[PDB]
Design a protein around this ligand. Structure first.
Ligand SMILES: CCCCCCCC/C=C\CCCCCCCC(=O)O
Length: 389
């Protein structure tokens, strides 16, 4: 059950209103991660409010549920900000006042919604995190001048590009560990993300899990940062799919893990450490393929994308895929230290010259937003353009 029927009505009946914080990239260039915000307004200059209710689990992470669509909220932010910026990369959150954190807005579905995907729910690590650590860090980590508003990149991540391409809302539960995230948030495991998804969606109105597209990418955090065994990670991944499918999930975007040892931070790792992580990645990838087929044989809608194979091609011949550099970070970071996520960094000369869209990597671990877009686009075109969904 997760949340009783009595708890749900009582929370949904506690109707109020809140304001919308409209965030945007201050620069026209994706080389500049810096952002700012304005309160959403109506065309007449009056305050834009959204009606609805608040709810938090014992996690105390507060979500605002509204009947107002994400399109209406986005449109209000676009018209309030009135930018001539194709790279404004607008994101929005519920907030009562200047002291409020960035709260995710859940737009409740209509009761008579058609049988079609109408939202994306992402589970995973820093490859899918859109800002889950950022409030906990008091908006200081990752430093908002060199990392795009709580994203471990210079812009949107792959899930945001997939959701945007299909004009769908994206609800994120993802959080990584390679940047020292676990110094700010406790429960970052895939199991905790599934539990959180199952708890917050009980509060939603007219929620049909069959209309959700689930994205899942997990294992690199475990292998890179916690030296977890392949069977431990295999079991957690199988458990996430068992739990989601038992809870009505029908549509999944699954991916093999890219070989993370090709990231710049492994220039500073020993051969032994690299060989260990690479071997674990290869074993996990055969298991992901077996899991994808297992659920596909049962009638579930599964899109399996071989990110590992795409990334081997991208890093061996960047010049064949729209990139100039696949070996160095775009930022001038020449060591692997988690403290670097606390400061502003200049772009290295080579990246300043080519632009961030020509580099595979943003920092020593994380890909640029151009790489994220490249994977999202390759995924969208794959499996005869999502014929399964
Ligand atoms: C899912 C889309 C991925 C697209 C870009 C490919 C990324 C490959 C490079 C490095 C992989 C590891 C980087 C992120 C760290 C994951 C673990 C963590 O968050 O702690």
């Amino acid at each position: 059950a997760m949340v009783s029927a009595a708890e749900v009505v009582s929370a949904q009946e506690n109707q109020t209103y809140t304001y919308v914080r409209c965030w945007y990239r201050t620069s026209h260039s994706k080389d500049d991660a810096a952002t700012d915000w304005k309160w959403a307004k109506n065309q007449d200059g009056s305050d834009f409010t959204i009606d609805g209710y608040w709810w938090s689990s014992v996690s105390f992470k507060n979500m605002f549920y509204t009947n107002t669509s994400q399109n209406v909220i986005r449109q209000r932010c676009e018209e309030t900000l009135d930018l001539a910026n194709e790279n404004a990369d607008i994101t929005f959150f519920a907030a009562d006042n200047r002291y409020s954190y960035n709260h995710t807005i859940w737009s409740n579905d209509a009761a008579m919604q058609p049988d079609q995907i109408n939202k994306v729910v992402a589970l995973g690590d820093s490859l899918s995190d859109t800002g889950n650590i950022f409030n906990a860090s008091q908006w200081r980590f990752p430093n908002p001048n060199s990392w795009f508003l709580g994203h471990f990149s210079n812009g949107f991540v792959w899930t945001e590009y997939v959701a945007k391409a299909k004009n769908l809302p994206l609800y994120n539960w993802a959080v990584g560990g390679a940047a020292g995230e676990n110094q700010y948030i406790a429960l970052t495991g895939v199991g905790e993300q599934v539990s959180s998804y199952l708890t917050y969606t009980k509060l939603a109105k007219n929620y049909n899990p069959a209309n959700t597209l689930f994205t899942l990418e997990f294992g690199l955090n475990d292998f890179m940062n916690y030296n977890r065994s392949v069977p431990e990670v295999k079991a957690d991944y199988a458990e996430a799919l068992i739990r989601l499918t038992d809870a009505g999930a029908k549509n999944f975007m699954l991916m093999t893990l890219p070989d993370a040892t090709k990231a710049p931070q492994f220039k500073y790792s020993t051969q032994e450490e690299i060989e260990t992580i690479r071997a674990k990645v290869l074993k996990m990838n055969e298991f992901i393929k077996a899991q994808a087929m297992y659920y596909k044989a049962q009638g579930y809608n599964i899109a399996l994308f071989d990110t590992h194979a795409l990334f081997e091609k991208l890093t061996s011949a960047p010049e064949e895929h729209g990139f100039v550099n696949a070996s160095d970070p775009c930022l001038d970071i020449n060591r692997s230290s988690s403290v670097d996520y606390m400061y502003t960094h200049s772009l290295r000369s080579e990246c300043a010259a080519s632009g961030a869209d020509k580099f595979v990597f943003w920092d020593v671990t994380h890909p640029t937003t151009a790489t994220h877009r490249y994977v999202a686009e390759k995924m969208l075109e794959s499996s005869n353009n999502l014929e399964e969904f």
